[PDB]
Structure formats: C-alpha cells, structure tokens
Write a protein that binds this ligand. Structure first.
Ligand code: CA
Ligand code: CA
Ligand code: CA
Ligand code: CA
Lengths: 18, 144
C-alpha cells in the first residue's frame, strides 16, 4: 500500500491547489 | 523521468513509514501504518509486501528501493490497480462509497487535520452526483 498512500496524499495536494 | 519535486513527494511518503527515520522500512513499521489505514495484515502478508520492493533481499526497504518502485508505478499512467488500491484504503467499510468520515480518517493519518467544512469540501470536489459520498467512478475521475 506504499503507492496507495502516496495517492491519498495526491488527492490532498490537488485539493490544496486551485 | 523523476523531477526534484517528485523525489520530494516520495520522500514524504517514505517518511510516513520510516517512523524512526533510520533510513529503512521494516515489516514492523509497515504493519503500524497498514493498521492505521484500516488493514490488519498478518506477518506473512507484511513480509510479502516488503519482499516485492526489497530488491537486494536484506529484509527491509531503503530509500533507493522505495524510489525505484514508486517511480515505476508512477510511469504506468495506464494502470488502474493502484487507484483501486487507494480506493480500498479510503473505503474502510467496503460499501463502495467513501464517506466524509472515511476521507477524514485517511487525511488524519497523513498528518492533515481538517475541519468538518474542509472535509465536506474535499468530498464535494469529487462528488459528481452530489449524494454526499465518493464512489469509485467519482474517485477515478478525481485522481485522473
Ligand atoms: Ca525505520
Ligand atoms: Ca533492501
Ligand atoms: Ca465506505
Ligand atoms: Ca457521489
């Protein structure tokens, strides 16, 4: 689940964006 | 190819598992994070997960090994298995819908404390049909 955890953080970053 | 920033994000991820910052992820540390993600892997399961990444077979994952694996999966933009895995991490009760509480739980684990409004906004951002939850179809679009 290493990459899945990275993706979860990706969901967040994109959110913090625009 | 990997950029300076990409490696930064991957180091963030690596640190989430390498709690003691000794440069290696052990099955013990992986178990701690997996249990924080709603899983309950057996030691055999954890060993298999470490093995897939532990290229030199010394029983643990170092940063170079972690980076190699993360860079490879990122290059497979055509793969959906990683997205399916992420969805399952969020969807703890397995009902096919990510609820506000389920999303908050994962974010809290990542060290991101969100207010109820921020959580609802995160849901809303992916919640195309507006039912208050994120299904798989909605999750994919959000991720892709
Ligand atoms: Ca460690
Ligand atoms: Ca190793
Ligand atoms: Ca659910
Ligand atoms: Ca929905």
């Amino acid at each position: 689940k290493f990459y899945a955890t990275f993706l979860a953080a990706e969901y967040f970053r994109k959110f913090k964006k625009r | 190819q990997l950029t300076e920033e990409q490696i930064a994000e991957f180091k963030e991820a690596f640190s989430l598992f390498d709690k003691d910052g000794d440069g290696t992820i052990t099955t013990k540390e992986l178990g701690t994070v997996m249990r924080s993600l709603g899983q309950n892997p057996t030691e055999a399961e954890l060993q298999d997960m470490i093995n897939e990444v532990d290229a030199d077979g010394n029983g643990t994952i170092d940063f170079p090994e972690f980076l190699t694996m993360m860079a490879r999966k990122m290059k497979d933009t055509d793969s959906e298995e990683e997205i399916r895995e992420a969805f399952r991490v969020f969807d703890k009760d397995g009902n096919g819908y990510i609820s506000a509480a389920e999303l908050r739980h994962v974010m809290t684990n990542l060290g991101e404390k969100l207010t109820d409004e921020e959580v609802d906004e995160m849901i809303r951002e992916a919640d195309i049909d507006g039912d208050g939850q994120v299904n798989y179809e909605e999750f994919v679009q959000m991720m892709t």
